[PDB]
Amino acid sequence: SGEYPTVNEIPVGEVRLYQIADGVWSHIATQSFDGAVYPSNGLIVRDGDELLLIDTAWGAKNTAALLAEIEKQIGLPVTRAVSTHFHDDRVGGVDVLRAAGVATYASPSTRRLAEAEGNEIPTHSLEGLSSSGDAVRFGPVELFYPGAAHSTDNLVVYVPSANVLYGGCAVHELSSTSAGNVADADLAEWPTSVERIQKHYPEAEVVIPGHGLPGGLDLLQHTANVVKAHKN
Ligand SMILES: COc1cc(-c2c(C(=O)O)[nH]c3c([C@H](C)N4C[C@]5(C[C@@H](CN)C5)OC4=O)cccc23)cnc1O
Numbered sequence: 001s002g003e004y005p006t007v008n009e010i011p012v013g014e015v016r017l018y019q020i021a022d023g024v025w026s027h028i029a030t031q032s033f034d035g036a037v038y039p040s041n042g043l044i045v046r047d048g049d050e051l052l053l054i055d056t057a058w059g060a061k062n063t064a065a066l067l068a069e070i071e072k073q074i075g076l077p078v079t080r081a082v083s084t085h086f087h088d089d090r091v092g093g094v095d096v097l098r099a100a101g102v103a104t105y106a107s108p109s110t111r112r113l114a115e116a117e118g119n120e121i122p123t124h125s126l127e128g129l130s131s132s133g134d135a136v137r138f139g140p141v142e143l144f145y146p147g148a149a150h151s152t153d154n155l156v157v158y159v160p161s162a163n164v165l166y167g168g169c170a171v172h173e174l175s176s177t178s179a180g181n182v183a184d185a186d187l188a189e190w191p192t193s194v195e196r197i198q199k200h201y202p203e204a205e206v207v208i209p210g211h212g213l214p215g216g217l218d219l220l221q222h223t224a225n226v227v228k229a230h231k232n
């Protein structure tokens with residue numbers, strides 16, 4: 001009823017959308033992993049009379065539900081999707097998207113890692129993002145590679161029309177007490193990568209983490225704090 005939806009609020013298999021700004025929504029879904037349930041976010045950005053999708057809803061069935069919820073709530077076609085790193089909460093559902101006529105994209109590093117790890121593989125490579133600090137335009141957003149953090153390949157997304165910063169899993173929510181799933185992380189480099197994000201997007205008004213509640217720019221410093229302390 002208007003609050004940001006939470007993990008106990010969304011059964012696994014259902015998807016909710018949340019209006020962030022004019023023409024910007026997040027999508028929220030839930031999934032089971034190693035015997036625990038987690039929420040996860042993605043982004044939807046209006047692209048004229050089309051939509052750009054950022055990240056799947058963490059699974060084929062969740063991502064089919066995502067497409068159905070978009071048709072219900074927005075009614076514009078999803079034509080392109082970008083996955084911001086190679087894990088299942090970002091690419092699981094890419095096969096569903098591809099069969100629905102969505103063109104799927106990720107960096108070559110993400111595509112290589114997804115293939116090696118047996119995850120679904122976006123079709124198209126996003127060049128121009130292989131060095132930390134790189135940025136490229138993609139429809140109504142800018143894609144930014146901050147350096148290794150939650151994963152070596154993780155990308156962030158900025159919507160300049162609304163000053164919305166989508167940090168993906170390189171950015172944690174304010175209530176976070178841990179650095180999340182650090183299996184593939186670079187804890188030593190993560191603070192440096194967050195500093196690059198902070199320097200590149202100082203006018204961000206909304207910051208959306210890969211999991212949990214959006215907030216403001218404080219999510220970036222909080223993330224650096226939690227990661228440094230996790231390493232401690
Ligand atoms: C520990 O508590 C939290 C965890 C998470 C969380 C995050 C995140 O932090 O982005 N990602 C997660 C993944 C994804 C699919 N996976 C799987 C994996 C393991 C490796 C294979 N060996 C690939 O690594 C990864 O990220 C699975 C379940 C939980 C998380 C978020 N909030 C929390 O509180």
Ligand SMILES: [Zn+2]
Nearest residue numbers: 085087150169
């Ligand atoms: Zn991940």
Ligand SMILES: [Zn+2]
Nearest residue numbers: 089169210211
């Ligand atoms: Zn994640």
